[PDB]
Amino acid sequence: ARKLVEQLKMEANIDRIKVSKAAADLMAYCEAHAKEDPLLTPVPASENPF
Amino acid sequence: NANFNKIFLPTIYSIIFLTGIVGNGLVILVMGYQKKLRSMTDKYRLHLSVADLLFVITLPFWAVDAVANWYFGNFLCKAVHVIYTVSLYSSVLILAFISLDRYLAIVHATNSQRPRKLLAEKVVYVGVWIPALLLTIPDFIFANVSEADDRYICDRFYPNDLWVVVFQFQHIMVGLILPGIVILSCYCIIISKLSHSKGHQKRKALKTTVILILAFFACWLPYYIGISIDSFILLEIIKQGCEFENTVHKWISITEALAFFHCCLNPILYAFLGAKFKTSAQHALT
Amino acid sequence: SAEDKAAVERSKMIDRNLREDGEKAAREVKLLLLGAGESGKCTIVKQMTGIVETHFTFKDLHFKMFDVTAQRSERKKWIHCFEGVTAIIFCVALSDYDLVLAEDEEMNRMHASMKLFDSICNNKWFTDTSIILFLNKKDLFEEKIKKSPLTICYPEYAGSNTYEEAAAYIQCQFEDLNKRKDTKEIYTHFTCSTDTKNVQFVFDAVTDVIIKNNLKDCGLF
Amino acid sequence: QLRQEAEQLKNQIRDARKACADATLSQITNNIDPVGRIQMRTRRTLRGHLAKIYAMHWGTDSRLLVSASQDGKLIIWDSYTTNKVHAIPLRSSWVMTCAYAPSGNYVACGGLDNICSIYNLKTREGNVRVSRELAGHTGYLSCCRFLDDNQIVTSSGDTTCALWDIETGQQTTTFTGHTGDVMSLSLAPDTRLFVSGACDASAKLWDVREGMCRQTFTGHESDINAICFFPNGNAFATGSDDATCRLFDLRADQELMTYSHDNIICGITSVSFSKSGRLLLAGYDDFNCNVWDALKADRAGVLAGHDNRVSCLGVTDDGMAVATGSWDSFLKIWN
Numbered sequence: 001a002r003k004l005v006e007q008l009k010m011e012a013n014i015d016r017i018k019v020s021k022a023a024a025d026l027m028a029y030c031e032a033h034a035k036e037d038p039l040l041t042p043v044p045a046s047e048n049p050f
Numbered sequence: 051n052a053n054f055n056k057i058f059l060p061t062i063y064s065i066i067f068l069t070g071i072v073g074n075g076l077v078i079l080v081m082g083y084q085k086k087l088r089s090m091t092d093k094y095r096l097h098l099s100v101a102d103l104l105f106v107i108t109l110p111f112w113a114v115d116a117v118a119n120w121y122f123g124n125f126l127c128k129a130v131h132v133i134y135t136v137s138l139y140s141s142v143l144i145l146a147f148i149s150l151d152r153y154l155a156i157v158h159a160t161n162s163q164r165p166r167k168l169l170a171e172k173v174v175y176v177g178v179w180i181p182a183l184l185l186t187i188p189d190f191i192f193a194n195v196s197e198a199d200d201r202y203i204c205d206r207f208y209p210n211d212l213w214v215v216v217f218q219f220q221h222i223m224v225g226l227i228l229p230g231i232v233i234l235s236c237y238c239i240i241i242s243k244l245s246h247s248k249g250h251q252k253r254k255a256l257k258t259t260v261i262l263i264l265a266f267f268a269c270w271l272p273y274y275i276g277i278s279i280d281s282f283i284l285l286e287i288i289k290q291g292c293e294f295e296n297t298v299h300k301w302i303s304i305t306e307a308l309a310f311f312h313c314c315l316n317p318i319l320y321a322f323l324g325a326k327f328k329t330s331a332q333h334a335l336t
Numbered sequence: 337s338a339e340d341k342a343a344v345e346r347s348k349m350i351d352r353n354l355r356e357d358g359e360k361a362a363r364e365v366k367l368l369l370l371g372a373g374e375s376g377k378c379t380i381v382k383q384m385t386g387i388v389e390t391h392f393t394f395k396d397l398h399f400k401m402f403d404v405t406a407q408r409s410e411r412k413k414w415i416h417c418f419e420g421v422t423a424i425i426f427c428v429a430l431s432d433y434d435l436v437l438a439e440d441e442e443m444n445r446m447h448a449s450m451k452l453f454d455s456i457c458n459n460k461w462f463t464d465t466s467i468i469l470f471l472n473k474k475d476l477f478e479e480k481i482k483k484s485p486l487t488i489c490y491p492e493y494a495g496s497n498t499y500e501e502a503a504a505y506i507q508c509q510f511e512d513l514n515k516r517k518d519t520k521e522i523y524t525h526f527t528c529s530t531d532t533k534n535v536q537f538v539f540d541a542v543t544d545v546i547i548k549n550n551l552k553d554c555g556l557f
Numbered sequence: 558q559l560r561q562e563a564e565q566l567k568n569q570i571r572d573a574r575k576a577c578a579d580a581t582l583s584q585i586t587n588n589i590d591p592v593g594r595i596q597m598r599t600r601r602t603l604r605g606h607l608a609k610i611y612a613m614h615w616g617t618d619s620r621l622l623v624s625a626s627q628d629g630k631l632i633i634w635d636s637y638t639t640n641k642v643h644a645i646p647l648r649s650s651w652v653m654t655c656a657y658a659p660s661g662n663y664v665a666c667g668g669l670d671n672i673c674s675i676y677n678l679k680t681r682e683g684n685v686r687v688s689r690e691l692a693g694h695t696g697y698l699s700c701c702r703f704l705d706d707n708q709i710v711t712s713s714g715d716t717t718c719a720l721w722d723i724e725t726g727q728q729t730t731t732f733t734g735h736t737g738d739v740m741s742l743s744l745a746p747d748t749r750l751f752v753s754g755a756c757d758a759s760a761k762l763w764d765v766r767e768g769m770c771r772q773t774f775t776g777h778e779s780d781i782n783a784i785c786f787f788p789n790g791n792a793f794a795t796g797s798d799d800a801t802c803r804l805f806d807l808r809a810d811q812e813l814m815t816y817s818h819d820n821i822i823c824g825i826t827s828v829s830f831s832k833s834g835r836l837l838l839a840g841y842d843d844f845n846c847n848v849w850d851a852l853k854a855d856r857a858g859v860l861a862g863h864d865n866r867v868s869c870l871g872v873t874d875d876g877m878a879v880a881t882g883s884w885d886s887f888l889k890i891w892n
C-alpha cells in the first residue's frame with residue numbers, strides 16, 4: 001500500500017483558496033457572459049435558425 | 051301502429067350514433083397521436099374506424115326520416131345511400147381481411163412477414179374499396195325520392211320484381227356468405243391450435259376469439275334471415291296471409307335496428323380489449 | 337438550388353436503405369447465453385473480444401447467439417442493452433452439485449448456479465423474456481450419483497437414488513425459482529450427445545415464443 | 558503501519574478542506590436576481606432510428622450532429638434541415654458512446670466490443686471507410702473524446718483511462734487509480750486536463766501530459782453517470798444514480814453546491830451546462846429533463862417530450878439549441 005500513501009502525500013501538499021473567492025469568481029463569470037446566452041434570453045425569430 | 055316506430059327507432063338510432071361517434075373518435079385520436087411506427091394491425095384499425103365513422107354519420111338522416119319523412123331533396127338521398135352502402139360493405143370486408151391476417155400471423159408465425167405486408171399494402175385497398183365502390187352503381191341509378199299520398203319517401207325503385215330479387219340475393223351474398231366463411235374458417239383454425247395449450251396467455255386469446263365469431267353472427271345472422279324469408283315471399287313460393295307479411299316487416303325492421311350496433315361494438319372489441327392499445331392510449335393521454 | 341435537391345434525394349435514398357435494413361433485421365432471432373462458473377459455453381458453441389457473436393441458420397431461420405462470459409465488469413451497467421432479446425439460454429452442470437468453488441470452498445457450486453439463475457430470472461429488464469434451460473453433463477451425473485448420495489446439496493431431499501427421480505427433483509427446484517408465472521415461461525431440456533435435438537428444441541421454443549408474441553401484437557389478448 | 562499513515566493523511570486533507578470553507582455559495586449568492594421560468598419548445602424531431610439511442614455529439618459548427626443507436630447505426634444528421642447527411646453501419650450493434658472530431662473529418666464509436674473505431678468522413682471517393690481500430694482495453698468503453706485529429710482519450714469499464722495515438726494505433730498513456738467502473742469523461746476547454754467519474758462514487762482530475770492524478774473529489778453515495786466542465790474550466794458538475802447533482806471546484810478542492818428535490822428518486826443519465834454557465838441541464842430516468850440554476854440551486858424548467866428514459870444530452874458551442882436523445886428512438890432539439 002506504498003503507492004496509495006505516495007499518492008496521498010502528493011495530492012495533500014497543495015495550496016487551496018477560500019470558498020468565497022471561488023464562488024465570487026464563478027458568479028462574476030456568469031454575470032459577465034450573461035449577455036451572450038441564447039438560452040437565458042430568448043432570441044427573436046429573425047435570428048433563430050430553428 | 052306508428053307509435054311503436056316513432057318512439058322506438060329514433061331513440062335507438064340516436065344512442066347508436068352517440069356511442070359510435072365517441073368510440074371511433076377516440077380510436078382515430080389514439081391512432082393518429084402515435085409517435086412510433088405503425089404495425090400491421092393498426093392500419094386495419096384505421097380502416098375499420100373510418101368505415102364505422104361513415105356508417106355512424108349516415109345515421110341522423112335515417113333517424114330524422116323515422117321522426118319526420120324525407121324532405122331533404124333528391125341528391126342528398128343518393129349521397130346518403132352511397133355512403134351507407136360503402137361503409138356497410140367495407141366494414142365486413144375489413145373484418146374478413148383482419149381475420150385472414152391474424153390466421154397468417156398465428157399459424158405461420160416465422161415464415162409469414164412479407165405476405166402479410168404485401169396483403170395489407172395492396173390487397174386491402176384493392177379488394178376492400180374497389181368492390182365496395184363498384185356496388186354503389188345501383189344507388190346512383192335507382193335511389194330516387196318519390197311522393198306517395200301526402201308523404202315523400204326515397205329508396206331504390208326497381209323496374210320490376212326480378213331486379214329486386216337479384217339485388218337482394220347479391221346483398222346477401224356479398225354481406226354474409228363471403229366474409230362469414232372467411233372469418234369462420236380462419237378463427238376456427240386458430241381456435242383448434244390454442245385449445246390444448248396450457249399457458250395463461252393462450253387461454254385469454256381463446257376467450258377473446260370465440261367471442262368475436264359470435265359478435266359477428268349474433269349481429270348479422272338474424273337480419274339477413276329476415277331478408278332471406280322476405281325474398282322467398284317475393285318469389286311466390288311462400289303462401290300465407292297479410293299477417294305473415296306484416297310480422298316479417300316488423301322482424302326485419304327490429305333486427306336491422308339491432309344489427310346497426312356493429313359500428314359501436316367494433317371499437318370495443320377490435321381496439322379496446324387489447325392491452326397494447328390500452329397502453330398506447332395511456333401514453334397518448336399524457 | 338440543385339444542391340438542396342441533391343441533399344434531399346440522398347437523404348431519401350439513405351432513409352429507404354435504413355428502412356430496408358430494419359425490415360431485414362426484424363426477421364432474425366437473437367438469443368443471449370448465460371452460464372455459471374463453467375461459463376456454460378461448451379456444448380452450444382460447438383454444436384452451432386468482449387462479446388462473441390455466433391450466427392447460424394436452421395429451417396430457413398437466422399439465429400444469432402451472444403456470449404458475454406468475457407465481460408467481467410459490473411453486470412448492472414450493461415444488462416439493459418440486451419432488453420428485447422428473443423430468449424436467454426441458461427446452462428446448468430448437473431454433475432456439479434458435490435463440488436465447491438476454488439475461490440471460496442464454503443459456497444456450493446450448484447447453490448451459486450441457483451442464485452445466479454434467480455437473479456437473472458427476476459430482473460426488472462427480463463420480465464417478458466423467456467428462458468431455455470439446458471442441463472448439461474447427464475451421463476457423468478448418472479454415473480456419479482450412485483456412489484455419492486444427493487444430500488450434500490439438498491438436505492431436504494427424500495427419495496430413491498435414481499437418476500430419473502433426482503433429475504426431476506433438480507428440474508423442479510430450478511423451475512420453482514420463477515416468480516412471474518403469468519408473463520414468462522421456462523423450457524427445460526436434458527442435452528443429448530446427438531446434435532439433432534438441441535437445435536430442434538431451441539427452434540421449437542423460439543417458435544412458441546414468437547407465437548405468444550404475435551398473440552399480443554395482433555391484439556388478441 | 559501504512560494504514561495509520563493513510564488515515565493521518567486523509568484526516569489532514571479533511572482538516573485542510575474544512576479550514577478553507579469560509580462561507581457557502583448560497584450564503585453569498587442570495588442577492589442576485591433569480592432567473593425567470595424557462596419555457597423551451599421543441600423545434601425539430603429527428604427520426605430514423607429503430608432502437609434505443611445511447612449517445613450523441615454536436616459538431617463544432619453547431620449544425621451537424623452524430624447519434625449512435627443499438628440497431629448498429631451511427632447517423633450524422635443536419636439539424637437545420639432535418640436531412641440525414643450520413644448513415645454508417647457499425648460492425649457491432651452494442652455501442653455505448655460516440656464522438657465527433659473538432660475538425661469534422663472523423664467520427665468515433667465504441668461499446669461492448671472493447672474496440673474504439675475511428676471512421677473517416679471527408680474521403681475523396683465520397684464513401685465512409687473505417688480509418689482505424691483501437692484495441693487494448695479489457696473493459697467496455699463508456700466514453701471517448703477527441704483532443705485533435707491524431708489524439709483520442711477513452712475511458713473503459715476496467716477502471717482505467719487511456720490516451721491513444723491514431724496514426725500508430727498504440728496506447729500512449731494509461732491513467733489508473735479508480736476502483737469502480739469509469740462511466741464518464743469530460744475534457745477541459747484548453748485540452749490540458751480532464752476529469753473522470755467512476756462507480757466508486759468519486760471523481761478524479763487527470764493531467765494529459767503528466768499522466769498522473771492531481772485531485773480527488775468525493776461526496777456521492779452511488780455510481781456517477783455523467784460529468785461536465787464549467788465553461789471557464791475552473792469547476793465541474795457531476796450526476797449520480799442517487800438522484801442528485803453536485804458542483805465541485807478545482808481551486809477550492811471541495812463541494813460547492815448540491816441540486817436535489819424530494820419528488821425525484823431516479824438517477825441522472827447525463828448533465829450539461831450552458832454557454833454562460835448559468836443553467837445546468839440534466840437528464841433523468843423519469844422520461845424528463847430538468848433545467849437547474851447553477852448559482853441558486855432552484856429548478857427553472859422541465860423539458861418533457863420523451864416517452865422513455867433520456868440517455869444523452871448536448872448543447873451547441875454557441876448555445877443556440879439543446880439536443881436530447883432518449884430510448885424512444887427520437888432526438889429532439891429545443892430552443
Ligand SMILES: c1cc(CN2CCCNCCNCCCNCC2)ccc1CN1CCCNCCNCCCNCC1
Pocket residue numbers: 112205214280283284295296298299302303306
Ligand atoms: C328491407 C326489406 C323489407 C321487406 N319488404 C320490402 C322489400 C320489397 N319487396 C317486397 C316483398 N315483400 C313485401 C311485403 C313483406 N315484406 C315487407 C317489406 C323491409 C325493410 C327493409 C329495409 N330497408 C333498406 C333500405 C336502405 N336503407 C337502410 C336504412 N333504412 C332504415 C329505415 C328502416 N328500414 C327500411 C329500409
Ligand SMILES: CC(C)CCC[C@@H](C)[C@H]1CC[C@H]2[C@@H]3CC=C4C[C@@H](O)CC[C@]4(C)[C@H]3CC[C@]12C
Pocket residue numbers: 088093096097100179
Ligand atoms: C370516401 C371513401 C372512398 C374514403 C376512403 C378513404 C380510405 C381509402 C383512406 C382514408 C384514410 C386512409 C389511411 C390514412 C393513413 C394511413 C397510414 C399509412 O401508413 C397506411 C395507409 C393508411 C392506413 C391509409 C389507408 C387509406 C385510408 C383508410
